[model samples]
Target: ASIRDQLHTIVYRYPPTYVLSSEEQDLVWKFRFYLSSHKKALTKFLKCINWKLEDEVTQALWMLANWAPMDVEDALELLSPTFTHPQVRKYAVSRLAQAPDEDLLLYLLQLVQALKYEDPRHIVHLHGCIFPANLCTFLIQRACTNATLANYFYWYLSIEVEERKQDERAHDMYAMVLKMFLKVLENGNFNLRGIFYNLRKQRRFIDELVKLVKLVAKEPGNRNKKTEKFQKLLAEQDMFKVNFTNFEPIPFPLDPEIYITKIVPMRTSLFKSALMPAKLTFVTSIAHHEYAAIFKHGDDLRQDQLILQMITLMDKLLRRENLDLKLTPYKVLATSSKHGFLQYVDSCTVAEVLAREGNIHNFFRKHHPCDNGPYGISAEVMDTYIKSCAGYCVITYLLGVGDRHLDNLLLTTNGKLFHIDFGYILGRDPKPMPPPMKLSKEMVEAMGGISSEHHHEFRKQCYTAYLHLRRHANVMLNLFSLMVDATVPDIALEPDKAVKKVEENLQLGLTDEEAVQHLQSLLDVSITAVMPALVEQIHRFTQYWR
Candidate 1:
């Protein structure tokens, strides 16, 4: 007849974990809610049950409605493995899913905030993931929606950091969520329009953000005292990366071994090498001025910056494609505005090399029959050359990177060629459709003869990379989806249509088998394509007049 007695009878007398009788079911449901409300009584009951009650479902529901308290420390404890209550955490997460509460969102935000500048001593001691996969999904979905909550969450985070930046324990909670914000931005399905509309309509929050965008958008060494004034004014601050002096590490790549310690700004890259426009060469300390990292300023935040942003994401996807494809993504990082940095591309532009040597084969060939010893290239350099070119080919064709020309294609001294200048992407090709890539006659000639074993191998690598990336078409689309409302220029030109362009390139209706063939066909057309070769030549002849 009594409440505790019913639970005891069901556990001890009835089947150990079978269905509860209707009367007992209702009683347990009713009993658990009351059980959670009183801390001492609930504590006593949990002890009575050994904290392992017969019905996990009952226990879960009880904890959800009247969850235990958590300060910032306890909050970190629950997320950290020290809590030893994954079941309860999972239960709470499940309950929030049914209809998430603002407080639940707030609580989750706090949890994520703790992850900021969040160093996980737990991974070493407790074996925890720095970003708990479940909690990250929970917090991101909630954080990117509704201006009231999103801004509230943002300011709450800012103030938390501002006040406690010195407090070692609290130092990171606010600093932590940008990675989460980036995750949401990449997911592409959430409604970021609320935040985006604020930027468009001139809300106070993004005033500094837009200012940061413009600051970098200007021609470098292009002075602006107003911009300098804005940077100091915390009117709009980038929670994740703020200010050029203390900005996001443009060189901290997805993979760290590819680091460029110092960058020396050279002349505008357009005149120096025609392969890319909106570029200035930064001589890296890595190889002296011998190897220069290209700094490309994107024209549009949506297209230019988005294209670079997707490269990091895509590089991760493609690397996992095969042991067969041993290409690392040529890493690039884009800062707040529409500008990005290329890891020192030690090679010359395919255009310049082609100009000097008369063609691709002569420039990259191991030993040209010609007199000078300057033409010898190592086989590993050859492999790096081919791998980088093939890698770029798959990714470029996949994303519909248009405006391809010899000027934008750089060939390393070793033999690799990589595409730079992604001003146009997502099928917005100003050029004709079929010959989308500029992988011309002399291009394949640089590798080997058209039907030679080496040429066929290059084609095979292209196939492998394309098929591998085809598998992640949805992932690419989703990541772009998040940035559709981005400050990217090309996307702003066609905001809603930005994602569709990605979808079209993804070729969604086709089977995976079909996609491989579609990409394969594109690669084939690019290889033998006559029109693009002529296009590059004319463009080069004209650009020299600049």
Candidate 2:
């Protein structure tokens, strides 16, 4: 049959079930020019191209130029492992080059991972590689030009370089890129390299500090007495020689542009966790500014770092789409297998807030008092509380964040709520039959319960945010697919099915309306679920005993 006649009879399917017969694909190639006009058809067209056929794929590559340029989002689809053709992938990079620096930084983490899909067989040598040159150079170029981007870019690649196996292509590419970075490091000795040395020096300082604190913690005295011993030990060891000087901004490892000038041993204290995480305080270079971070040992924090990485990325994704939920996806950095730093927001646990203030509403009222306000709390505070609640509900559900309990859920005085202690994720929980999402009675009561206007607004925001995230599920899935081999604890437990497990959570087969409906049902089930609430009670009782 003629191409036009075949196209008239053949039906095209959408993705997740998108399949085209060989003859239908032939017709697609013949009418590629027409299909190119519809941007929605791009993914289907790319999916049909047969990479095994060199001549056919070469022709397909030639035709790609005539197609309308892809938007950045569509371009990202090409970088996924599904598309193995280098020319097709490079075309995506060419389009990505047009994106603004701020916009590009949002996807920088995934883009770095996308380099893994680039065949190392295409490489010329370590000095001049073909596969990673565009994306790698793009990253290094931006990092060199901007301090904020450089700080993150350097850390992102360095972590890969530090942790990855020696034989992996990305490890080599990252190592070489770091080596190339040395020139910038030596450019009038710009402290790009100094940041590297600072990490080492800070590790030394923190190690000694943790040991001294542990020594004091072991003593049989009260906190005040132990604090005095801690101070005395600091004086005795004289181990506080951290050089926070000569660097441009001296960004904190957990966050960028937040500079600290001095460490405060007097304010340091131990958290009550099994690991005894230390709450360390720092005097910022800015006057009257202080930053606090939780440092821990005896527990591997790489998994926590990965979870925060995704949360931070998801927050960026949501914000970029103009849907702000006021998420406080705070920063985490695992400096080593057993130790790291966590950015500590000024917040109280829902457990602590409820126990001390009797209820969440009272806690908010005490912190953000108002005589003439909704529920006697500031309107803005209530708004923040509702929005943050909605945001975390969607994010935690999608990521399958586990081990959710009142102790790890924190609420700031300003009403920003967030989760901490991501010890279990991807559906791994200590308790049985955990709710798909966490929306407890007190959480709903804080917003005046199921009948209130605030609760209604919360559900509306949840639907919108969930659907918006569904739109970017491809990108999210691609990012997670890249991490399956990263050896993150929960992911490593079931590496083969990790991405598939997330795919199930996303339920990509459903339409937007159907997906939102499903999520709504999940939220309903979560709200009414008796098991999680009972588990929280058990957890609370145990904590009280401790």
Candidate 3:
């Protein structure tokens, strides 16, 4: 019933609270993902180019609207003849040609769902909807996001009910499975879902239903012949066995920048690039328990671009300063808009990594063995670890890069800590009182504990880096100032505040002593904060819904 209403017309809000409820998190996250494309607004600009005419505008609107093609009722209403100018509509209707067939799109998603679960004689429910290939490409894109409720093209991709040796036709399994699915699409009429009122009795089920579709498609004179003959005709004749892979594999309309993925399309979206390889690989990772490797809260690439810029800038700034900040710079490359890839030195979660050899100290002592003094890593590498960790803490804290969970926190093989998932940044943490910085116990322990000379050195590095960035505040702030127009939620929502937020982190105009003192307070608050643990407690409670 819910799906019935959802598909036909649709497919909400919360707040300024410091912490988000589980429902609120999912809501915010999903909304953020779709934040980039403002289809209607872009149409006006598209019209400015050669064909802003009524026909062109509507055509552009319909194509832009359909791709992720998730939801567009309100947008479509704007394009309707009643709302639009008559003269414009006249030219637009012709140019618009056939907009994305939302009707067909929805029906296919529903059908895919039914087929996925193999609902009783589900093929019958979509019978009349069969015999089409125009949407074959569009369907694949939607499938990329799993809106069609598919994780894999065929069932075997999802399960192993029988070993290859055990199943009769296990070889080239996906091919055979696709063949059956196509057959149903080509001939199955049991698909009239609204009219599928005849629930079968177990007694005559097989006999009565057999060839029901075959008889309907066959000539009346030929229908009287053995049903087995039609079955033989289909299999032996290879009926439509054209590999049938030759459907509308090419994309029509415009080629979009970002391809939909489960991240965008739900279950999926793919790049609309004609130049892309035959297959695209989306790597999914997991850490901090349930923190599945994912991207930002919203699809605001601007924020993503900003952070990459920030990191790159910091990487440059750290290099110039006399201070030895351990800048273990990571890579964040955005391509075609939202789709991006990251590069990191091999690493692990601090907790999971260090604990492997029984505490961080022991692991370093064992892994980087020494013959004299103590079994420990060289000062240079240890310095690298300290400087890199220091860079992240000071920088992330100052930037208000929130959602700093254990899962997102990673440690490299040589012992540097970094973060991923900028979904919640710019002071927008989903939990309560995120530490001004995360000074985890393991991290401190790895640097020879609070009492060691190394610990003192580590603190010095962090403070020094903070001071360096503050000195060059104009450089960083100016970059963010330029990004005021970008659609990243936190900044876009409050651009001036965003600038102030950074300035606030600097606590500018303080004397050198005051700046040092400010850094001290931040570290103290972060190291001692009880709120991070509390935030996790809340996260655990709320995640029940997710």
Overlapping backbone residue pairs in candidate 3 total 35
Models ranked on TM-score: 2, 1, 3
Candidate 3 lDDT, 82-174, residue by residue in tens: 233333323333222233543333223122222222222323333334434212223333333331222223221222222223133332332
Residue 12 lDDT in candidate 2: 36
- Stretches of candidate 2 off by over 4 Å are 1-27, 38-41, 121-124, 128-134, 161-177, 187-249, 371-373, 531-546
Model 2 lDDT at residue 298: 68
Off by over 4 Å in 1: 1-302, 324-342, 366-377, 432-434, 508-513, 531-546
How far residue 498's Cα lies from its native spot in candidate 2, in Å, is 2.4
Order the numbered candidates by lDDT, best leading. 2, 1, 3
Q: How well does candidate 2 match the true structure in TM-score terms?
A: 0.81
> Which window of 10 residues has the lowest lDDT sum in candidate 1?
10-19
Best by lDDT: 2
| Of 2 and 3, the candidate ranking higher by lDDT | 2
Kindly state the number of residue pairs that clash in model 1: 13
lDDT of each: 0.48, 0.71, 0.45
Q: In order, how many clashes per candidate?
A: 13, 0, 35
Alpha-carbon lDDT of model 3: 0.45
Q: Per-residue alpha-carbon lDDT of model 2 for 350-422, expressed as tens digits?
A: 9999889899999889888988978889899999999999999888888899888889899999998989998
